Amino acid sequence: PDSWDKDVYPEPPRRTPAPAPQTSLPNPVTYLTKIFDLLVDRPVTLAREFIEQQHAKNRYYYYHREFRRVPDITECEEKDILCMFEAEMQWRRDYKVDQEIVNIIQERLKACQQREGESYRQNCAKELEQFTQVSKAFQDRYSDLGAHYSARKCLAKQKQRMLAERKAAKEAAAA
Amino acid sequence: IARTFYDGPEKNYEKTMAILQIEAEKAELRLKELEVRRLMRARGDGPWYQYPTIDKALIDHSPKTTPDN
Numbered sequence: 524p525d526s527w528d529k530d531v532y533p534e535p536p537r538r539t540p541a542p543a544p545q546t547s548l549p550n551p552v553t554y555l556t557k558i559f560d561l562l563v564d565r566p567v568t569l570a571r572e573f574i575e576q577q578h579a580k581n582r583y584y585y586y587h588r589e590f591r592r593v594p595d596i597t598e599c600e601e602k603d604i605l606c607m608f609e610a611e612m613q614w615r616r617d618y619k620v621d622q623e624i625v626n627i628i629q630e631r632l633k634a635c636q637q638r639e640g641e642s643y644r645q646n647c648a649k650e651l652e653q654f655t656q657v658s659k660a661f662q663d664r665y666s667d668l669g670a671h672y673s674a675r676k677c678l679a680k681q682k683q684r685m686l687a688e689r690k691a692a693k694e695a696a697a698a
Numbered sequence: 699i700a701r702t703f704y705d706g707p708e709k710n711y712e713k714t715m716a717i718l719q720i721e722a723e724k725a726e727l728r729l730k731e732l733e734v735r736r737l738m739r740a741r742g743d744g745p746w747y748q749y750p751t752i753d754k755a756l757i758d759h760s761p762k763t764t765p766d767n
């Protein structure tokens with residue numbers, strides 16, 4: 524339904540075939556599902572309708588909290604405690620958001636694997652590629668920081684990787 | 699529960715800022731005091747580590763029965 528964004532959690536157009544009876548015998552599944560409908564789905568629907576009627580008479584709202592951007596750890600002086608504190612809080616929030624991004628991608632992958640059935644090895648290639656890219660980026664950002672991680676250690680890791688990449692590029696240039 | 703028992707995040711955030719400022723200033727002051735103590739004890743040119751010397755007011759500046767003191 525409309526509870527979630529359908530672009531963040533996409534699904535295929537859901538093609539399902541029409542019944543094609545070939546036997547004169549009746550279908551026990553159809554009879555049982557008609558009984559289930561009439562005996563289960565209607566009272567539950569009525570209870571939900573009553574509950575939603577009660578809810579509509581009391582409509583109140585909650586809001587998503589907004590955070591502005593503060594200077595990063597790169598723009599902080601060495602011993603400036605306040606700027607470091609704000610930058611560290613911002614970095615921790617970004618870390619949580621990145622974890623949730625990875626979680627969304629993994630949810631997509633799992634759903635595709637279940638959905639595609641016997642053809643999952645070929646029909647889930649795109650989700651697997653997206654997970655591979657996101658996992659590589661996340662591993663580059665946050666892996667091996669250890670317990671007691673911080674923004675400063677992440678910055679040191681990025682600087683080390685940048686130095687290695689610059690050296691490799693200059694050595695390949697001399698080839 | 700939030701309305702009855704707790705405050706918003708800004709209170710804890712800014713209280714943390716104040717606490718961090720106080721503690722950082724105290725640490726800097728401690729290091730500065732140690733350095734000042736070292737310098738004052740090494741040179742003896744400050745108010746601290748002043749050890750007594752003989753008072754010059756004890757000297758008698760009178761003729762001493764001999765011209766050459």
Ligand SMILES: CCCCCCCCCCCCCCCCC[C@@H](O)O[C@H](CO[C@H](O)CCCCCCCCCCCCCCC)COP(=O)(O)OCC[N+](C)(C)C
Pocket residue numbers: 700701702703704705
């Ligand atoms: C209604 C049913 C559905 C929901 C049920 C929810 C269950 C919740 C009830 C259980 C109690 C939760 C534990 C209480 C911990 C709170 C302690 C403290 O943190 O809260 C103080 C609040 O003090 C309250 O008075 C706490 C009182 C709770 C004490 C429990 C006593 C129960 C004893 C049972 C006695 C029953 C009869 C005994 C017969 C002998 C905060 O003081 P304050 O400085 O303002 O904070 C400022 C924040 N402001 C701005 C939002 C106000």
